[PDB]
Amino acid sequence: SLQKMVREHLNPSGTSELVMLSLELVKTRLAVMSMEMRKNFIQAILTSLIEKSPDAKILRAVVKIVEEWVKPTLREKSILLVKM
């Protein structure tokens, strides 16, 4: 669902922030349980916001996501950071 809705929103709503605020829960829990397959989708989606750019507010939210995230190893953590 999140991938498809992000893809549709990428063609041109605030629901894009809310959908990620779902996975934020598991990120809070351990953030390590199911990375093997998620990581690719996560990086692609999060960099989708870095591109395009009309998503100023969700951009403002992802920084909060990472700010909590810092305390997912160094590479997985900085791959998005360097781009953004």
N, CA, C and O atoms as CSV, one atom per row, in Angstrom:
chain,resi,resn,atom,element,x,y,z
A,1,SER,N,N,0.824,-1.202,0.000
A,1,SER,CA,C,0.000,0.000,0.000
A,1,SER,C,C,0.859,1.253,0.000
A,1,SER,O,O,0.633,2.158,-0.803
A,2,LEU,N,N,1.847,1.317,0.896
A,2,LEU,CA,C,2.656,2.527,0.969
A,2,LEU,C,C,3.410,2.753,-0.332
A,2,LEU,O,O,3.484,3.884,-0.813
A,3,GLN,N,N,3.973,1.691,-0.911
A,3,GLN,CA,C,4.690,1.833,-2.171
A,3,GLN,C,C,3.770,2.346,-3.268
A,3,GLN,O,O,4.126,3.280,-3.987
A,4,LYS,N,N,2.587,1.743,-3.406
A,4,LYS,CA,C,1.693,2.148,-4.485
A,4,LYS,C,C,1.224,3.586,-4.303
A,4,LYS,O,O,1.166,4.342,-5.273
A,5,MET,N,N,0.890,3.977,-3.073
A,5,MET,CA,C,0.380,5.327,-2.871
A,5,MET,C,C,1.491,6.353,-3.047
A,5,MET,O,O,1.246,7.440,-3.572
A,6,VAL,N,N,2.713,6.026,-2.617
A,6,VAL,CA,C,3.843,6.911,-2.875
A,6,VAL,C,C,4.081,7.037,-4.371
A,6,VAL,O,O,4.377,8.127,-4.861
A,7,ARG,N,N,3.956,5.930,-5.106
A,7,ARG,CA,C,4.148,5.980,-6.549
A,7,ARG,C,C,3.121,6.892,-7.201
A,7,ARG,O,O,3.469,7.706,-8.057
A,8,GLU,N,N,1.855,6.765,-6.804
A,8,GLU,CA,C,0.819,7.626,-7.365
A,8,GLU,C,C,1.059,9.084,-6.991
A,8,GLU,O,O,0.936,9.970,-7.837
A,9,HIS,N,N,1.402,9.340,-5.726
A,9,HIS,CA,C,1.683,10.697,-5.274
A,9,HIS,C,C,2.923,11.277,-5.939
A,9,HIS,O,O,3.083,12.496,-5.984
A,10,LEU,N,N,3.803,10.424,-6.457
A,10,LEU,CA,C,5.011,10.853,-7.144
A,10,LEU,C,C,4.749,11.291,-8.577
A,10,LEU,O,O,5.572,11.998,-9.159
A,11,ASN,N,N,3.617,10.886,-9.163
A,11,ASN,CA,C,3.324,11.285,-10.538
A,11,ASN,C,C,3.161,12.792,-10.668
A,11,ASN,O,O,3.781,13.370,-11.560
A,12,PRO,N,N,2.363,13.475,-9.832
A,12,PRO,CA,C,2.231,14.934,-9.916
A,12,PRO,C,C,3.573,15.654,-9.835
A,12,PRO,O,O,3.618,16.883,-9.892
A,13,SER,N,N,-0.835,14.663,-1.365
A,13,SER,CA,C,-1.690,14.761,-0.188
A,13,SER,C,C,-0.904,14.437,1.078
A,13,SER,O,O,0.088,13.710,1.035
A,14,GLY,N,N,-1.357,14.984,2.207
A,14,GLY,CA,C,-0.662,14.781,3.465
A,14,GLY,C,C,-0.678,13.347,3.950
A,14,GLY,O,O,0.081,12.996,4.853
A,15,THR,N,N,-1.532,12.503,3.368
A,15,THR,CA,C,-1.608,11.111,3.796
A,15,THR,C,C,-0.282,10.390,3.595
A,15,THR,O,O,-0.047,9.347,4.204
A,16,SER,N,N,0.588,10.936,2.744
A,16,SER,CA,C,1.903,10.342,2.546
A,16,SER,C,C,2.714,10.345,3.835
A,16,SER,O,O,3.455,9.398,4.097
A,17,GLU,N,N,2.586,11.395,4.644
A,17,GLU,CA,C,3.260,11.413,5.937
A,17,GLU,C,C,2.654,10.378,6.878
A,17,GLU,O,O,3.379,9.668,7.574
A,18,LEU,N,N,1.322,10.294,6.900
A,18,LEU,CA,C,0.655,9.375,7.813
A,18,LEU,C,C,1.022,7.929,7.513
A,18,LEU,O,O,1.237,7.145,8.437
A,19,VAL,N,N,1.097,7.562,6.233
A,19,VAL,CA,C,1.392,6.175,5.890
A,19,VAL,C,C,2.758,5.768,6.438
A,19,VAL,O,O,2.909,4.661,6.955
A,20,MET,N,N,3.755,6.650,6.332
A,20,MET,CA,C,5.071,6.338,6.878
A,20,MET,C,C,5.026,6.335,8.400
A,20,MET,O,O,5.732,5.555,9.040
A,21,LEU,N,N,4.203,7.200,8.984
A,21,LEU,CA,C,3.997,7.167,10.425
A,21,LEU,C,C,3.376,5.859,10.894
A,21,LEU,O,O,3.136,5.696,12.090
A,22,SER,N,N,3.108,4.919,9.986
A,22,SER,CA,C,2.756,3.565,10.389
A,22,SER,C,C,4.007,2.736,10.656
A,22,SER,O,O,4.171,2.199,11.752
A,23,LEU,N,N,4.891,2.629,9.661
A,23,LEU,CA,C,6.149,1.921,9.863
A,23,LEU,C,C,6.991,2.562,10.953
A,23,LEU,O,O,7.870,1.907,11.513
A,24,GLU,N,N,6.740,3.835,11.268
A,24,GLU,CA,C,7.456,4.453,12.377
A,24,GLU,C,C,7.291,3.654,13.664
A,24,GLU,O,O,8.192,3.653,14.502
A,25,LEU,N,N,6.157,2.972,13.839
A,25,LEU,CA,C,5.949,2.173,15.042
A,25,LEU,C,C,6.965,1.040,15.133
A,25,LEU,O,O,7.634,0.888,16.155
A,26,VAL,N,N,7.086,0.242,14.069
A,26,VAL,CA,C,8.055,-0.849,14.092
A,26,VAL,C,C,9.468,-0.299,14.165
A,26,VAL,O,O,10.341,-0.923,14.768
A,27,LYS,N,N,9.710,0.865,13.561
A,27,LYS,CA,C,11.012,1.506,13.713
A,27,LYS,C,C,11.297,1.787,15.182
A,27,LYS,O,O,12.420,1.592,15.647
A,28,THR,N,N,10.282,2.245,15.913
A,28,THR,CA,C,10.434,2.434,17.351
A,28,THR,C,C,10.697,1.107,18.053
A,28,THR,O,O,11.517,1.044,18.969
A,29,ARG,N,N,10.008,0.044,17.632
A,29,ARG,CA,C,10.096,-1.220,18.360
A,29,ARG,C,C,11.521,-1.761,18.363
A,29,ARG,O,O,12.175,-1.769,19.406
A,30,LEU,N,N,12.011,-2.213,17.208
A,30,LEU,CA,C,13.405,-2.626,17.097
A,30,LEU,C,C,14.052,-2.071,15.833
A,30,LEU,O,O,15.249,-1.787,15.818
A,31,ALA,N,N,13.258,-1.917,14.772
A,31,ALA,CA,C,13.747,-1.420,13.490
A,31,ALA,C,C,14.706,-2.399,12.824
A,31,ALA,O,O,15.333,-2.058,11.820
A,32,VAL,N,N,14.831,-3.614,13.365
A,32,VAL,CA,C,15.760,-4.588,12.800
A,32,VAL,C,C,15.064,-5.883,12.395
A,32,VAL,O,O,15.696,-6.758,11.804
A,33,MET,N,N,13.772,-6.021,12.701
A,33,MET,CA,C,13.119,-7.322,12.577
A,33,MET,C,C,13.055,-7.804,11.132
A,33,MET,O,O,13.300,-8.982,10.872
A,34,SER,N,N,12.731,-6.926,10.187
A,34,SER,CA,C,12.417,-7.388,8.842
A,34,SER,C,C,13.063,-6.479,7.803
A,34,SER,O,O,12.410,-6.069,6.843
A,35,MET,N,N,14.344,-6.164,7.991
A,35,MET,CA,C,15.028,-5.228,7.110
A,35,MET,C,C,15.401,-5.878,5.781
A,35,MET,O,O,15.509,-5.182,4.771
A,36,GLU,N,N,15.603,-7.204,5.759
A,36,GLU,CA,C,16.223,-7.865,4.610
A,36,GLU,C,C,15.566,-7.464,3.298
A,36,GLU,O,O,16.257,-7.168,2.324
A,37,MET,N,N,14.235,-7.453,3.266
A,37,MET,CA,C,13.513,-7.126,2.049
A,37,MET,C,C,13.007,-5.692,2.078
A,37,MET,O,O,12.878,-5.063,1.028
A,38,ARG,N,N,12.718,-5.161,3.270
A,38,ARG,CA,C,12.184,-3.807,3.354
A,38,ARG,C,C,13.198,-2.768,2.897
A,38,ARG,O,O,12.828,-1.788,2.250
A,39,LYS,N,N,14.476,-2.968,3.224
A,39,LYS,CA,C,15.451,-1.890,3.095
A,39,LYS,C,C,15.408,-1.243,1.716
A,39,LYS,O,O,15.458,-0.018,1.609
A,40,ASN,N,N,15.315,-2.048,0.657
A,40,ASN,CA,C,15.288,-1.478,-0.686
A,40,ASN,C,C,14.087,-0.560,-0.871
A,40,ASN,O,O,14.230,0.558,-1.364
A,41,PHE,N,N,12.903,-1.028,-0.478
A,41,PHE,CA,C,11.703,-0.211,-0.622
A,41,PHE,C,C,11.823,1.054,0.213
A,41,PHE,O,O,11.437,2.135,-0.232
A,42,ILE,N,N,12.358,0.923,1.425
A,42,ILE,CA,C,12.493,2.074,2.311
A,42,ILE,C,C,13.385,3.130,1.672
A,42,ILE,O,O,13.011,4.301,1.606
A,43,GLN,N,N,14.565,2.724,1.200
A,43,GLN,CA,C,15.484,3.697,0.616
A,43,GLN,C,C,14.886,4.329,-0.633
A,43,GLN,O,O,14.966,5.545,-0.809
A,44,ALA,N,N,14.285,3.515,-1.506
A,44,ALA,CA,C,13.684,4.060,-2.717
A,44,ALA,C,C,12.591,5.066,-2.382
A,44,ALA,O,O,12.553,6.153,-2.959
A,45,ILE,N,N,11.701,4.716,-1.453
A,45,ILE,CA,C,10.593,5.599,-1.109
A,45,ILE,C,C,11.115,6.890,-0.494
A,45,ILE,O,O,10.705,7.979,-0.896
A,46,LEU,N,N,12.018,6.778,0.482
A,46,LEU,CA,C,12.487,7.963,1.188
A,46,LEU,C,C,13.240,8.898,0.251
A,46,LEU,O,O,13.115,10.117,0.369
A,47,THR,N,N,14.022,8.347,-0.680
A,47,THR,CA,C,14.670,9.193,-1.673
A,47,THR,C,C,13.684,9.714,-2.711
A,47,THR,O,O,13.967,10.707,-3.380
A,48,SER,N,N,12.528,9.061,-2.858
A,48,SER,CA,C,11.476,9.611,-3.702
A,48,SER,C,C,11.062,11.002,-3.246
A,48,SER,O,O,10.798,11.867,-4.082
A,49,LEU,N,N,10.998,11.237,-1.936
A,49,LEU,CA,C,10.716,12.571,-1.427
A,49,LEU,C,C,11.862,13.536,-1.669
A,49,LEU,O,O,11.628,14.694,-2.015
A,50,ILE,N,N,13.098,13.082,-1.493
A,50,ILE,CA,C,14.254,13.916,-1.784
A,50,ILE,C,C,14.210,14.408,-3.221
A,50,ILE,O,O,14.550,15.560,-3.493
A,51,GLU,N,N,13.795,13.546,-4.142
A,51,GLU,CA,C,13.522,13.988,-5.499
A,51,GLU,C,C,12.133,14.627,-5.567
A,51,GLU,O,O,11.399,14.660,-4.579
A,52,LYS,N,N,11.793,15.131,-6.751
A,52,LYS,CA,C,10.541,15.844,-6.984
A,52,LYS,C,C,10.531,17.161,-6.211
A,52,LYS,O,O,10.709,18.224,-6.807
A,53,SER,N,N,10.324,17.106,-4.878
A,53,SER,CA,C,10.511,18.221,-3.941
A,53,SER,C,C,9.242,18.935,-3.459
A,53,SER,O,O,9.315,19.619,-2.438
A,54,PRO,N,N,8.085,18.824,-4.124
A,54,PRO,CA,C,6.892,19.529,-3.613
A,54,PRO,C,C,6.442,19.103,-2.222
A,54,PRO,O,O,5.445,19.629,-1.728
A,55,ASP,N,N,7.136,18.173,-1.570
A,55,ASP,CA,C,6.639,17.580,-0.335
A,55,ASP,C,C,7.262,18.234,0.892
A,55,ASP,O,O,7.560,17.557,1.876
A,56,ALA,N,N,7.460,19.554,0.836
A,56,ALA,CA,C,8.177,20.269,1.890
A,56,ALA,C,C,7.845,19.736,3.282
A,56,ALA,O,O,8.747,19.513,4.088
A,57,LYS,N,N,6.559,19.530,3.571
A,57,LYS,CA,C,6.175,19.145,4.926
A,57,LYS,C,C,6.617,17.721,5.252
A,57,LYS,O,O,7.120,17.468,6.347
A,58,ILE,N,N,6.437,16.791,4.317
A,58,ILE,CA,C,6.868,15.423,4.588
A,58,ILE,C,C,8.388,15.368,4.669
A,58,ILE,O,O,8.941,14.562,5.417
A,59,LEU,N,N,9.064,16.220,3.903
A,59,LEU,CA,C,10.500,16.397,4.065
A,59,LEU,C,C,10.821,16.834,5.488
A,59,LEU,O,O,11.749,16.314,6.107
A,60,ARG,N,N,10.051,17.789,6.006
A,60,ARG,CA,C,10.191,18.241,7.385
A,60,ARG,C,C,9.932,17.126,8.387
A,60,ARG,O,O,10.480,17.154,9.489
A,61,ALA,N,N,9.109,16.147,8.030
A,61,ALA,CA,C,8.787,15.049,8.936
A,61,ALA,C,C,9.863,13.964,8.932
A,61,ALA,O,O,10.183,13.405,9.981
A,62,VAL,N,N,10.419,13.664,7.759
A,62,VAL,CA,C,11.410,12.595,7.674
A,62,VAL,C,C,12.642,12.942,8.497
A,62,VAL,O,O,13.298,12.047,9.030
A,63,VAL,N,N,12.966,14.230,8.609
A,63,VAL,CA,C,14.106,14.618,9.432
A,63,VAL,C,C,13.836,14.283,10.892
A,63,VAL,O,O,14.743,13.855,11.606
A,64,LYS,N,N,12.595,14.474,11.347
A,64,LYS,CA,C,12.229,14.036,12.689
A,64,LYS,C,C,12.339,12.525,12.818
A,64,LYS,O,O,12.806,12.017,13.837
A,65,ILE,N,N,11.908,11.804,11.783
A,65,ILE,CA,C,12.028,10.348,11.796
A,65,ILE,C,C,13.477,9.953,12.038
A,65,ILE,O,O,13.763,9.115,12.893
A,66,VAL,N,N,14.392,10.557,11.282
A,66,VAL,CA,C,15.806,10.210,11.416
A,66,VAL,C,C,16.339,10.659,12.770
A,66,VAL,O,O,17.157,9.966,13.376
A,67,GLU,N,N,15.881,11.817,13.250
A,67,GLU,CA,C,16.341,12.321,14.536
A,67,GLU,C,C,16.003,11.354,15.656
A,67,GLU,O,O,16.806,11.166,16.570
A,68,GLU,N,N,14.828,10.737,15.602
A,68,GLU,CA,C,14.557,9.654,16.540
A,68,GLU,C,C,15.410,8.435,16.205
A,68,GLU,O,O,15.892,7.744,17.103
A,69,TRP,N,N,15.596,8.173,14.911
A,69,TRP,CA,C,16.266,6.955,14.475
A,69,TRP,C,C,17.685,6.859,15.013
A,69,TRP,O,O,18.154,5.761,15.312
A,70,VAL,N,N,18.380,7.991,15.144
A,70,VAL,CA,C,19.788,7.949,15.525
A,70,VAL,C,C,19.995,7.216,16.842
A,70,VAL,O,O,21.074,6.670,17.073
A,71,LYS,N,N,18.990,7.189,17.709
A,71,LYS,CA,C,19.073,6.395,18.928
A,71,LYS,C,C,17.689,5.912,19.344
A,71,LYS,O,O,17.555,5.223,20.356
A,72,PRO,N,N,19.595,-0.862,12.635
A,72,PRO,CA,C,19.980,0.226,11.731
A,72,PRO,C,C,21.417,0.689,11.956
A,72,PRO,O,O,21.663,1.581,12.769
A,73,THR,N,N,22.364,0.088,11.239
A,73,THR,CA,C,23.769,0.391,11.446
A,73,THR,C,C,24.199,1.575,10.580
A,73,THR,O,O,23.385,2.197,9.897
A,74,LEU,N,N,25.500,1.870,10.628
A,74,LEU,CA,C,26.002,3.136,10.105
A,74,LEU,C,C,25.701,3.288,8.620
A,74,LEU,O,O,25.234,4.342,8.189
A,75,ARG,N,N,25.962,2.246,7.832
A,75,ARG,CA,C,25.744,2.348,6.393
A,75,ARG,C,C,24.270,2.557,6.081
A,75,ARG,O,O,23.913,3.464,5.328
A,76,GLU,N,N,23.410,1.718,6.659
A,76,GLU,CA,C,21.981,1.836,6.407
A,76,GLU,C,C,21.465,3.190,6.858
A,76,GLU,O,O,20.461,3.678,6.340
A,77,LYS,N,N,22.146,3.800,7.821
A,77,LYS,CA,C,21.719,5.045,8.434
A,77,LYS,C,C,22.164,6.252,7.618
A,77,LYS,O,O,21.428,7.232,7.504
A,78,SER,N,N,23.367,6.185,7.050
A,78,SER,CA,C,23.939,7.317,6.337
A,78,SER,C,C,23.637,7.291,4.848
A,78,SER,O,O,23.792,8.312,4.177
A,79,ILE,N,N,23.209,6.147,4.310
A,79,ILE,CA,C,22.910,6.080,2.884
A,79,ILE,C,C,21.898,7.146,2.495
A,79,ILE,O,O,22.078,7.828,1.486
A,80,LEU,N,N,20.836,7.301,3.281
A,80,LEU,CA,C,19.844,8.333,3.010
A,80,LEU,C,C,20.347,9.705,3.438
A,80,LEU,O,O,20.069,10.708,2.780
A,81,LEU,N,N,21.090,9.745,4.546
A,81,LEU,CA,C,21.515,11.011,5.127
A,81,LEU,C,C,22.366,11.804,4.149
A,81,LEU,O,O,22.163,13.007,3.982
A,82,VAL,N,N,23.320,11.138,3.498
A,82,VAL,CA,C,24.210,11.841,2.584
A,82,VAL,C,C,23.440,12.468,1.433
A,82,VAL,O,O,23.737,13.595,1.040
A,83,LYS,N,N,22.453,11.760,0.884
A,83,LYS,CA,C,21.674,12.307,-0.221
A,83,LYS,C,C,20.833,13.489,0.239
A,83,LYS,O,O,20.870,14.558,-0.371
A,84,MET,N,N,20.073,13.298,1.320
A,84,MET,CA,C,19.181,14.362,1.757
A,84,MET,C,C,19.977,15.583,2.174
A,84,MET,O,O,19.395,16.591,2.576
